């Protein structure tokens, strides 16, 4: 039969590992997102 929406996506060691290495980069090159402080 068919499906109507996409519910809860199961995570595993591999999905967590993929996001793990990408954030290992994304602080290894120290790029970083923030609120910026307006003067005056």
């Amino acid at each position: 039969f068919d499906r109507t929406a996409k519910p809860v996506p199961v995570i595993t060691s591999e999905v967590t590992e993929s996001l793990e290495d990408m954030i290992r980069r994304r602080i290894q090159d120290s790029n970083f997102d923030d609120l910026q402080r307006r003067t005056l």
Binding site: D2, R3, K6, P7, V10
Partner: protein, 39 residues
């Protein structure tokens, strides 16, 4: 002293309990299997 005996070591209700256990596990695996395959 009043001696007590050592308490030491029907088919219907545990059938129901592990029937709902069986439906839980099969529904989990078929949910993930078909959602997986469909996407």
């Amino acid at each position: 002293i009043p001696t007590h005996a050592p308490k030491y070591e029907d088919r219907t209700r545990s059938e129901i309990n592990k029937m709902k256990a069986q439906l839980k596990k099969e529904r989990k695996f078929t949910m993930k299997e078909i959602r997986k395959d469909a996407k």
